[PDB]
Each structure stands twice: as structure tokens, then as C-alpha cells.
């Protein structure tokens, strides 16, 4: 069962890859939120102190 066997395990390995794909891509995306937030959170201070 050489061919189809290893092909199926490569299939499943691919699947594992895509779950990794998500976790990483949207972990970056979610970090973007507070990445933004801190900016304006300093910014209103930056505007009004002067």
C-alpha cells in the first residue's frame, strides 16, 4: 500500500499545516488590534497636553 498510503499521510500532514496556517495568521491579525489601540491611547494625550 506504498503509494496511496504515503499519499494519505501527506494529505493529513497538509491538513495539520492548514490548522497551523490559521493559528499563526489570525494570531498576527488579532495582535494588530492592541497594536493599533496603544497608538491612539497615547495619541489623545499627545494632542491635549500641548
Amino acid at each position: 500500500a506504498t503509494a496511496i498510503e504515503r499519499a494519505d499521510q501527506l494529505a493529513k500532514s497538509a491538513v495539520a499545516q492548514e490548522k497551523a496556517l490559521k493559528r499563526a495568521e489570525e494570531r498576527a491579525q488579532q495582535l494588530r488590534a492592541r497594536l493599533d489601540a496603544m497608538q491612539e491611547a497615547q495619541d489623545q494625550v499627545r494632542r491635549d497636553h500641548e
Partner: peptide, 26 residues
């Protein structure tokens, strides 16, 4: 000073917690 390291130590968790799942996948 004591302020300084705390971030890294706390971030260590956030750093460390990463190792938890991706290994667990396999």
C-alpha cells in the same frame, strides 16, 4: 529596574504558551 524584567517574565508565558499547542498537534 524591577519594572523592567517583569514584562519579559510575563511575556515568557505568552512566549512559552506558544510551545504548548503546536507540539500537541502531533
Amino acid at each position: 529596574l524591577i519594572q523592567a524584567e517583569e514584562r519579559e517574565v510575563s511575556a515568557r508565558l505568552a512566549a512559552a504558551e506558544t510551545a504548548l499547542g503546536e507540539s500537541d498537534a502531533r
